[PDB]
């Protein structure tokens, strides 16, 4: 079939891509720059697909084939093609190259591709045996570059276990395997492992256990954008549950900003799900441009009816939505947070009153927030004032909630401080740009 | 100076946003007249930023030393 003929052409091109990866993989090993591998690993997701049984076999029959037990491990785990007419022997290793054991980078990369194919073939156990052996191979392997290729495999290995749906067997493994990186000052591997570990933690709701891990651990600042985006969501999820709302918004909005423009329709879907609920509990009505966007249109529409409820403050409407769309929230892992809101709808209206009125008499606050009595609002009016949702002072001598007299900020020191955080980053960007500058060793 | 640097950014946008690739290495050598790209660029940034930093630091030192 011409589809497979293009497939083998895709195979050879993927082999050429792999050969490009392996040649670059073998490039970095002798190129003295782990950066090269990152390019091959970013093509990994792209080359992750577009492969069937003939691909790996010819790759493993093209790569490796040193008569090493490696062939004996993944060849049986993947269906072998017949005596195909186009037997393009794709051996980047010729003789001595075959005789030389495959570098830990390419072998895992090829094995990961098998692992990926194992995932692509749903063979998480053969991959399990493949992968842990991969790890059992790379567990001993202590190179500096393999840490990268190991990091990708880890999430896939976490992902193979991810489809295995245990996540506790790897809870310890990923928990210890992490410590191997940190004792190596390795950058990427520590980043990737932590995100997979945390996902493990939230998946069973051990927020207490998770909240600790972020407390002591330090996420490498010079981390992959992809990872930095992930860690920010998980921390945002933890912070939101821990009742540290204000920080939950700052990280989640920052986590969202780091999403890979338009590749991950999902991640943006879930984060917006928490951001909208996270924002509501803090007293801020979320952005409307969200709910109209294409990808998040139907996904967040369930939350849409909510945010309309809070602004309306019609508790009967709010309960009605939880009754209907509430059950769906649980799967999203948000029902609990919404339950907080049901007894927190009064805050925003307290903010709306403080944002527009500046000296509203308490009795008036009760009228405009549906509070039962003028006395009841006082605790709520102060509480919102107490909790820093307002900036007002309740003069109980005559029952009026005065708002703070706003000042000319430009004559105070706020603008200078805002410029400092800005200039420090701007200067740092110059140093980071200049600092690397990667002048290749003049050829 | 900020006004003069602004006009120099306009060219910087035009000079870069052009990014014409008809032998760009030759483009970078057929348009050398001590012009927009950098020489009249941050060259002013150093002057502008040196003048302010020194002035500001003098301002704060005096605020401390003299009462």
């Amino acid at each position: 079939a011409a589809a497979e003929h293009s497939q083998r052409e895709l195979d050879t091109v993927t082999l050429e891509d792999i050969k490009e990866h392996v040649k670059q993989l073998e490039k970095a090993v002798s190129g003295k720059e782990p950066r090269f591998v990152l390019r091959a690993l970013r093509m990994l997701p792209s080359t992750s697909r577009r492969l069937n049984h003939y691909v790996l076999y010819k790759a493993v029959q093209g790569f490796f084939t040193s008569n090493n037990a490696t062939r004996d491990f993944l060849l049986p785990f993947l269906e072998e093609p017949m005596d195909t007419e186009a037997d393009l022997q794709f051996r980047p290793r010729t003789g001595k190259a075959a005789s030389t054991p495959l570098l830990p980078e390419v072998e895992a990369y090829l094995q990961l591709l098998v692992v990926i194919f194992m995932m692509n073939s749903k063979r998480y156990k053969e991959a399990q045996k493949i992968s842990d052996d991969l790890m059992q191979k790379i567990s001993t392997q202590n190179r500096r570059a393999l840490d990268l290729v190991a990091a990708k495999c880890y999430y896939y290995h976490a992902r193979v276990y991810e489809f295995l749906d245990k996540l506790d067997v790897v809870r310890s493994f990923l928990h210890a395997r992490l410590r191997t990186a940190t004792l190596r000052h390795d950058a990427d591997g520590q980043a990737t492992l932590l995100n997979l570990l945390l996902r493990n933690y939230l998946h069973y709701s051990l927020y207490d256990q998770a909240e600790k891990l972020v407390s002591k651990s330090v996420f490498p600042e010079q981390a992959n954008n992809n990872e930095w985006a992930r860690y920010l969501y998980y921390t945002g999820r933890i912070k939101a549950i821990q009742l540290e709302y204000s920080e939950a918004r700052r990280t989640m909005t920052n986590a969202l900003r780091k999403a890979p423009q338009h590749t991950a329709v999902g991640f943006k879907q879930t984060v917006h799900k928490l951001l909208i609920v996270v924002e509501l509990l803090l007293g801020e009505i979320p952005d409307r441009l969200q709910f109209r966007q294409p990808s998040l249109k139907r996904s967040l529409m369930p939350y849409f009816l909510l945010t309309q409820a809070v602004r309306t403050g019609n508790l009967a409407k709010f309960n009605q939505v939880l009754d209907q769309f509430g059950e769906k929230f649980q799967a999203d892992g948000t029902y609990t947070l919404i339950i907080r809101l049901r007894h927190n709808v009064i805050k925003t209206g307290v903010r709306m009153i403080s944002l527009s009125y500046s000296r509203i008499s308490l009795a008036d606050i009760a009228q405009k927030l549906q509070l039962d009595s003028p006395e009841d609002a006082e605790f709520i009016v102060a509480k919102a004032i107490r909790d820093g949702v307002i900036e007002a002072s309740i003069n109980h001598e005559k029952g009026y909630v005065q708002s703070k007299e706003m000042i000319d900020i430009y004559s105070t020191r706020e603008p200078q401080l805002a410029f400092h955080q800005r200039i420090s980053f701007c200067l740092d960007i110059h140093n980071m740009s200049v600092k690397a500058m990667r002048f290749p060793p003049k050829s | 100076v900020v006004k003069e640097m602004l006009e120099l950014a306009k060219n910087y946008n035009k000079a870069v946003e052009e990014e014409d690739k008809m032998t760009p290495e030759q483009l970078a050598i057929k348009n050398v007249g001590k012009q927009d790209p950098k020489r009249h660029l941050e060259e002013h940034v150093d002057v502008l930023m040196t003048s302010n930093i020194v002035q500001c630091l003098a301002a704060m030192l005096d605020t401390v030393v003299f009462k």
Partner: peptide, 30 residues
């Protein structure tokens, strides 16, 4: 701050121009 930003965008532009320079020469070597 405006001085700082200009010096930063110029810095990044100079790394992108340089990243292209060594990469392009990298491929062109083959």
């Amino acid at each position: 701050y405006l001085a700082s930003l200009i010096r930063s965008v110029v810095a990044l532009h100079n790394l992108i121009n340089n990243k292209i320079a060594n990469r392009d020469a990298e491929k062109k070597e083959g």
